[PDB]
Amino acid sequence: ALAQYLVVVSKLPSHLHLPPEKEKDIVKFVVATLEALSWHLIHEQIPLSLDLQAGLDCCCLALQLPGLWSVVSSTEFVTHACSLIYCVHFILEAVAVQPGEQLLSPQNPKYITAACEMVAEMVESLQSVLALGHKRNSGVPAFLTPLLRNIIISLARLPLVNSYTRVPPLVWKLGWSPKPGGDFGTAFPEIPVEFLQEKEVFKEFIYRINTLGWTSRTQFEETWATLLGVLVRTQINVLAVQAITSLVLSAMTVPVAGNPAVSCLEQQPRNKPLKALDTRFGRKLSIIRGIVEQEIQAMVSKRENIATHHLYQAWDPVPSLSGALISHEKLLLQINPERELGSMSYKLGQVSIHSVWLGNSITPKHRAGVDIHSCSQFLLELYSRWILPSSSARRTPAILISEVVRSLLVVSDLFTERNQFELMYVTLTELRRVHPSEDEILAQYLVPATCKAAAVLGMDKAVAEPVSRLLESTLRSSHLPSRVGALHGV
Amino acid sequence: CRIKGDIGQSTDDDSAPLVHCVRLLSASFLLTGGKNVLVPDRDVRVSVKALALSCVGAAVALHPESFFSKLYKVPLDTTEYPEEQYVSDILNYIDHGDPQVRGATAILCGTLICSILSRSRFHVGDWMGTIRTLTGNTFSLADCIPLLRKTLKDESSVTCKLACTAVRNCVMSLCSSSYSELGLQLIIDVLTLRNSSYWLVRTELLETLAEIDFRLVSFLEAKAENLHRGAHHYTGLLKLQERVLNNVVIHLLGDEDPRVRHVAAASLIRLVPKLFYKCDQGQADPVVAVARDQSSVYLKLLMHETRIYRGYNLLPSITDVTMENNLSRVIAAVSHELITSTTRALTFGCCEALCLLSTAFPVCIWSLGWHCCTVGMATMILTLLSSAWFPLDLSAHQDALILAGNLLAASAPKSLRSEVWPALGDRALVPMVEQLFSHLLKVINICAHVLDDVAPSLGSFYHLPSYLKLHDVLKATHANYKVTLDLQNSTEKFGGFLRSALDVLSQILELATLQDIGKCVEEILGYLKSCFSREPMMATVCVQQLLKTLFGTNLASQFDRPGLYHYCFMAPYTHFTQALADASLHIRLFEPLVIKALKQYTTTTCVQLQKQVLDLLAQLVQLRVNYCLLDSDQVFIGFVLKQFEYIEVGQFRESEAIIPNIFFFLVLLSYERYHSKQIIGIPKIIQLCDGIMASGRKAVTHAIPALQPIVHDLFVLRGKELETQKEVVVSMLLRLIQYHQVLEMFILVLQQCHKENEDKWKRLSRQIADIILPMLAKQQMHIDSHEALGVLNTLFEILAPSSLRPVDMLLRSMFVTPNTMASVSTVQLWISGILAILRVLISQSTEDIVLSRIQELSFSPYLISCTVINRLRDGDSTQIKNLPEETFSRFLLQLVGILLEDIVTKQLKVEMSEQQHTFYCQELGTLLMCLIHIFKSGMFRRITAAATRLFRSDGCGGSFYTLDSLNLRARSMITTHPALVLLWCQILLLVNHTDYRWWAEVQQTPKKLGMCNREIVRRGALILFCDYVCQNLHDSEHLTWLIVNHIQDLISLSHEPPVQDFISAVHRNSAASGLFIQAIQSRCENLSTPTMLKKTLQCLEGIHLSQSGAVLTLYVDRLLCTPFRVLARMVDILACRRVEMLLAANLQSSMAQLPMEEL
Amino acid sequence: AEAGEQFGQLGRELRAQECLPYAAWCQLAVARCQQALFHGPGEALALTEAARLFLRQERDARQRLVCPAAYGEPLQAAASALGAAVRLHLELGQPAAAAALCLELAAALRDLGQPAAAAGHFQRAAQLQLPQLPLAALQALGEAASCQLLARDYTGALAVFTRMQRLAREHGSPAALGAFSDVLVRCEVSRVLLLLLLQPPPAKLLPEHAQTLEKYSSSGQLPEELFLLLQSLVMATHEKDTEAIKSLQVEMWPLLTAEQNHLLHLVLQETISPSGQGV
């Protein structure tokens, strides 16, 4: 009952929202239910699947509500937060790992350090054990893999264990062991950039931040500065460029910017709302086509942004820019046709140039209090100097140039000012005139980015012909993704 | 490093020397006089401490009692050392500093566990009970288990490797004991060792798991409830066999270390017989699977009874259904890794595993296992040969060549007829055979270029880049070989590859004909000329196959519910009874390549090549090739004769491998005539044979193999001079008549003599019988093995019954006494002689005849009494109207006592071998089988009456084995030989010995998973007891006792035939049915499992009509309401039937069954 | 010839420094050189290596470090190279090698979160293997059925399971040969669970499904406890006794795989809370 209530409380009227005076009791109840499932598992046997789902559904949804998350995150509820970590880890092991097997096959009270180790263990398990369809997931029923993934990411963002979890395990075995200090005694400092100079530990750090996102503006700036320090052997540079691109892109997730467990990337479809609706007869179609659509979603749409089992919860990440998300019933046939039903991962046509010209007031920011213009401006200046060797820049590596240009194309979705688009087009246009054209791994990103830049610029006469010469040229290419990206640029 | 007291002396009498030896080197290097005081390593280095600990473990292996002794025999000063110390304190070195000492302590615990269990006969409850009374030690056998567990999780890889070795010694003993749950725990713990960076730990784990009998493990898993939960409350099942097979054995086939891959493949082969899968036709539950293995050896009833290549099997094979299923499941798993192989290591490992599997379990024999005759998976293996990277690995390439040839050869019977490759007649396989044949000619052509070091039409490869790369790999390996001198290195990659290529080509040449080869036959002979010097054996084997194909002599050119009762008792008894019943009843091209084989024969010292040249020469003569054209000056035949001088004086390095081929070649050459001149005569061959036996060379390897090609020639296919040679050979066979191999030779001679001259068959049978029978009395026959006794058993049947009809000689030889019984070999020879004669008496004669002749030859029942037995066991060689049946029955009962006493009181390694232990149990099994047949067939009534009376009677003043003495020796064999105990249980019924002292104990009647062997007896005894009641329905006590005490086992075992009849008998009797219902009500809680509840209803279905009112009460009270709806439906159907047959009967009878209050 | 070896060592060096997109590009170049040399096996190997490098790129961008900026870009190149390799293999025969490449692509897609395309490629591999390796085709179809169950294509999974049962019966025989017996057991249990979930009407009820449902209203190759529990489950779902399915679901949990446990959970869920009502 509670899970059914919480899964819809995000789109309820104001008077039906969660009462603040009952937020503490709900958190206590959620922990108690998970404790009961573990206690029943310990004593008698595994609980009913409808009981495991009900207990974990409440935990998954409660950690998604900002009202309830701020309660479990408080120091007063540290025991409850530790109990959730214990019960979730216990249930996951009691269902996925056999006896004699490991989950990861290669001052303060003791439970605090144990809870930190549990979450860091489970976070790494999302790679193999809790990756749906992975060979290691064969031991986990498919109705618990998406439920446990969301819970772990929500638990790993708790202030108690977030600082510890972001530290790669490869650093712990090394000499790094600073004295933790904070409200919980586990606010470990951010790892020094000296460790990140090694590839295999930088990969672990990138996975940790990408999986957990960021909990606040302060954390975003910290990891922004950390990645900047690394970005000044080439393997470290491409890894840093990718990590910065993901971090900057992570600000576009609509409901809550940082949270990966509640949010998905912004979608601005290129198709305007249909005129045939909202008529005398089209309105009747919407009522009846909505029922058909409400069942196609529950049957064929990969519920990427939905964690719990509830069927009628589909919603698209399309904010009402002019804001709150547009209800799915009002986006009948607006979503991009080339996007899979329910798929919310990044795509090459993520945001339409309409939404670039609207809200930004452009003729042909700072989401959740995180200044992205200062960021997006910085890389644009940084990347432009990097891929333009005006002086003797010792022939910048091709892998760097390709990965940088891909970064430009991805972060171009967050470019706010017209001058930003003009600079990137000029930067790319100069890159074409100097880079040899036999490269295809580069042209797959360069072609759409240049087309996207000229698209916002207004497709003017001077900018028209070079793009027109480019698009046909890359159309007859042996590399398929070069053709695919070319069409997206088209 | 100082002995601070008295430890005893080596020359001491009150205790074994090993007790002092353990004390000596424990106080000298490992312990002080104080409790829990490790000797500091300053005085003795850890090298000595590690070396001394291994000495204790090896000593404790032969004598576990030494480990529990006090450190000092005389207790030293009680003031300086307040508490005495035990030798068992050396286990504190499990926490030492260096890894080597820690590992040695782990191995000591593993050895200690295995020895204690193997010495107590799994009765550790009593063995540890007396050892703690004799020495006062409070050590528990369940204390080394934590030591082994924590030593497996060791930081050092050296210690972890030694900890794995310790588990390997004691894992199977623990599983087969009352500590099975600890043995199961160890298997779980060692599973994590696959993720080890040290390859030695990985290989050690593979060998450890290869020792596991998973039929036993599956039994332990089936009844392990809390062990499935593990330490973290797991909600599934352990699935140990699935994890061990897939996550370890198959998984490690993909290891990057070839040594680990090779061990995994070998461990895969060993595991295949021991796997267990549910829903198998051969075995239903693990208990039956375990009982099959044990009964297949002890109860192995003993009897006796143009060359296709290695991988062909035409005649139908009586293949086991069970392990064909195991083979198919394993082969499927290996192949699934071969398709989904992303690494070169997994492809190399899996291809090697299948090549080895096709050798251990030939695909031509187990075609139903190799994915149905079959070709198995030949497109896959031939795909790899057509790849661009797989052929370049010489080790894996030759694994695929052999495997591909085996699979194609496995379809030969069902894929022949009587274009290209006309004989195949299954044109689907023609591309596969054509591809492999062309591929083999290419690689052999490559090797031909490599030996001939000439730079690079069917075998042409100069235009294929993939073969040019292979030629470079083979060129490199030979170049390395060309500058080394390692002649004793078998694992030479180039030499192994050329051998494998010539091996498979020789195999495929069977399926070919002259039509599809006569074009390319000259190019292959060119390849062999260059490849002959490197690999002369297989180059000659390939020549033979070419001749067999060129002359049309190859295969292508010449073509036209079982449960415990069945396995334990019924199937072996039926075979034994039936056996008793039947007892009473272009060539010019080869010449350059054949002179080289002759020329190399006279210069090489390789007997494998030498015995192959003779094989080629024998085949050439059989094809009527003029021998004078080969031996232009009698040089080779002269050289062969000159080899005998070195052979008979022991100056031939290995003559046993060449004698069978030399004589077979010579006897075949006696027919050929050098233009009216014989090359050699049979008289000379006979004289050559007699010189071999006359010398000191063992007749088993030099004289007997020499005779076989001679007797199989004269006496199977061949009269003025022939007859006298036959008698001379017969005379020579008589000298070696003590060897069971010669008995086979005489069996052949008698059988052929049975068709030429029946009168001579009578004389020869009388001559043989009058010769062997005295030697059976004096134990001069080499019949101390299962194979040897089986040959002798069939020889008696082949003998003319007139030669044995006067049973005076048989009884004189059977009723004898050996020189001594202190030697196991003498005891076995004595009993083996008795069993051979005993079979004749109960098969080729009647009870009346045997008992009658016992009176005239006054054999005494005291021939082997307890007094004579004890006196003989020390090596000392020096009445009334007793009916003959008493003497005959006493003789057999004493033999049972002898075998029981020294099977359960004879050391497995100190006093007797391992083969001697099996033959001891085999001898007991065939003796108990003989007793069962005598007491069950009814053809021996007086003997059965005498035995029934003698079993009931006590021992005559302790001079004979009383029944209680026999039961004690049999009751202690439950844990080790349950198959033999069940035979003893059968005999106890046949003599109507049904006291509940023995029966309520073997059945574990109610007045820690347990042992599987205890369950085999417990279920087996219950089955036999029910069968006995089925023949004794008048007895109303053994029927009510079974129901009220074993109804749960009756229901569980209801699928067994004897139990089925017992339940049917219970249904027919009204009183029995009433007890059947009442017992179920009192034990309904255990009848809650859906499997057990269904069996309860099946039994409860056809119950007696007069009990309808009672069973209907049980249905609607304790069985109707179940969570399982299918069983509730079944109860409803049966309950409806009871009501519909109650109102359809007499009213007053139905009124009695259901009173009004009950209704 | 020499250009191919040059591109090969270029790719080896590039993989040494782990700039594997360019290593895959060099593998494509050496595959083109093999095309110029008309060497089918070498070209297939080069395309396989390029596809494996691209797949490792996508795995790193999606599994090792989960980059939200990744839009499956090297996956397209991997699929193109694998399709070219499969086409080459088929044009030179060797359908087993093409089926192996298709299995590799399907496994990669399944790990990357695209069960539908993975199931399609698994079915293609099974079709390529079926005329020659029926057991390998059955395993590939089993992977396809697992992927379709991942994609919530329950009717497609039922069709694949029925096809596998038919193929196992007609190829592995009457009693199965062990290697086909486990396949038949999985087919039977999965089909029974899927038929209790979907509940086809008489129009959609094929003769095979009707026969299988008749069998559960004796045990061919299923363990007696599992067969009895499945019969109880079928009777309970035909009777609508939710307590019975709850008790069975608790009871049959250790005896079923995680896939079959998920299917039984779906059956129970659609029993208490039917889907399609809109509430």
Distance from CA of B186 to the nearest CA of A (A): 10
Distance from CA of B140 to the nearest CA of A (A): 25
For tokens 């083996």, what's the residue? B832
CA B905, B909, B912, B913 torsion: positive or negative?
A: positive
In contact, A422 and A456? CB cutoff 8 Å: no
Question: Among residues 548-577 of chain B, which lie with CB inside 8 Å of chain C?
Answer: none
Check if C87 contacts A (Cβ < 8 Å).
no
Element (H, E) at B149: helix B144-152
Q: At B529, is the secondary structure helix, strand, or coil? A: helix
Check if A95 contacts B (Cβ < 8 Å).
yes
Check if A323 contacts B (Cβ < 8 Å).
no
In contact, A148 and A133? CB cutoff 8 Å: no
The torsion defined by the Cα of A114, A118, A123 and A127, in degrees rounded to 10, comes to 140
For tokens 């003043």, what's the residue? B957
Token pair for B6: 């008295």
How far apart CA B576 and CA B308 sit, in angstroms, is 34
- Per CB-CB distance under 8 Å, the chain C contacts of B329 are 178-179, 182
- Per CB-CB distance under 8 Å, the chain A contacts of B242 are none
Q: At B51, is the secondary structure helix, strand, or coil? A: helix
Distance from CA of A100 to the nearest CA of B (A): 5
Check if B431 contacts C (Cβ < 8 Å).
no
Terminal CA-CA length for chain C: 67
CA B454, B460, B462, B464 torsion: positive or negative?
A: negative
Closest C-alpha to B51, from B32, B18, B28, B80: B28
How far apart CA A280 and CA B863 sit, in angstroms, is 119
Question: Among residues 369-388 of chain B, which lie with CB inside 8 Å of chain C?
Answer: 369, 371-372, 377, 379-380, 383, 386-388
Q: At B140, is the secondary structure helix, strand, or coil? A: coil
> Which conformational region is residue B882 in: left (phi greater than 0), alpha (psi within -120 to 50 degrees), or beta?
beta
How far apart CA C94 and CA C110 sit, in angstroms, is 25
Q: How many CB pairs under 8 A join A and B?
A: 43
- Per CB-CB distance under 8 Å, the chain A contacts of B238 are 98-99
Distance from CA of C278 to the nearest CA of B (A): 32
In sequence order, which ranges of A10-77 are alpha helices (DSSP H)?
Answer: 23-43, 49-62, 66-72
Mutate to test the interface with C, among B227, B279, B361, B1129 (most CBs of C within 10 A): B279
In contact, A170 and A204? CB cutoff 8 Å: yes
The torsion defined by the Cα of B1113, B1114, B1116 and B1119, in degrees rounded to 10, comes to 180
In contact, B273 and B329? CB cutoff 8 Å: no
Write the residues followed by a gap in chain B (C–N more than 2.5 A). 305, 372, 418, 456, 560, 585, 718, 878, 1007
Contact A347 C118 (CB under 8 A): no
Phi, then psi, of B981 in degrees rounded to 5: -65, -35
For tokens 């496994």, what's the residue? C107
Contact A142 C149 (CB under 8 A): yes
Contact B243 A41 (CB under 8 A): no
Angle between helices C134-150 and C115-129 (to 10 degrees): 170
Check if C25 contacts A (Cβ < 8 Å).
yes
Q: What does this entry list as its resolution, in Å?
A: 2.7
How far apart CA B740 and CA B744 sit, in angstroms, is 7
Nearest by CB to residue A94, choosing from B195, B227, B232, is B232
How far apart CA B172 and CA C246 sit, in angstroms, is 40
Closest C-alpha to C98, from B380, B346, A135: B380
- Per CB-CB distance under 8 Å, the chain C contacts of B370 are none
Q: How many CB pairs under 8 A join A and C?
A: 137
Phi, then psi, of B74 in degrees rounded to 5: -90, 125
Give chain C's count of helices (H) and strands (E). 13, 0
Distance from CA of C93 to the nearest CA of A (A): 25
In contact, B207 and B269? CB cutoff 8 Å: no
In contact, B1026 and B1058? CB cutoff 8 Å: yes
Q: At B638, is the secondary structure helix, strand, or coil? A: helix
Check if B329 contacts C (Cβ < 8 Å).
yes
Token pair for B958: 């302790």
- Per CB-CB distance under 8 Å, the chain B contacts of A48 are none
Comparing alpha-carbon positions, the chain A residue that sits nearest to B230 is A99
In sequence order, which ranges of B736-757 are alpha helices (DSSP H)?
Answer: 740-756
How far apart CA B306 and CA B579 sit, in angstroms, is 33
Token pair for C187: 């087919």
Residue A99 C-alpha from the chain's centroid? 34
- In one-letter notation, the amino acid at residue B1004 is Q
Token pair for A442: 């580069």
Comparing alpha-carbon positions, the chain B residue that sits nearest to A136 is B247
Method: cryo-EM
Distance from CA of A445 to the nearest CA of B (A): 30
- Per CB-CB distance under 8 Å, the chain B contacts of A139 are 236
Closest C-alpha to B525, from B606, B438, B611, B594: B594
Distance from CA of C247 to the nearest CA of B (A): 7
Chains with 3+ CB–CB pairs under 8 A to C are A, B
Check if B228 contacts C (Cβ < 8 Å).
yes
In contact, B627 and B621? CB cutoff 8 Å: yes
Chains with 3+ CB–CB pairs under 8 A to B are A, C
How many residues appear in chain B?
Answer: 1159
In contact, B363 and B374? CB cutoff 8 Å: yes
Phi, then psi, of A204 in degrees rounded to 5: -65, -40
Closest C-alpha to B778, from B809, B836, B817: B817
Check if B941 contacts A (Cβ < 8 Å).
no
Rg (CA), chain C: 23
DSSP per-residue codes, B665-713:
HHHHHTT-BSSS-BSS-HHHHHHHHHHHHHSSS-IIIIIHHHHHHHHHH
Check if A138 contacts B (Cβ < 8 Å).
no
For tokens 């229901």, what's the residue? B1051
CA A335, A341, A347, A348 torsion: positive or negative?
A: negative
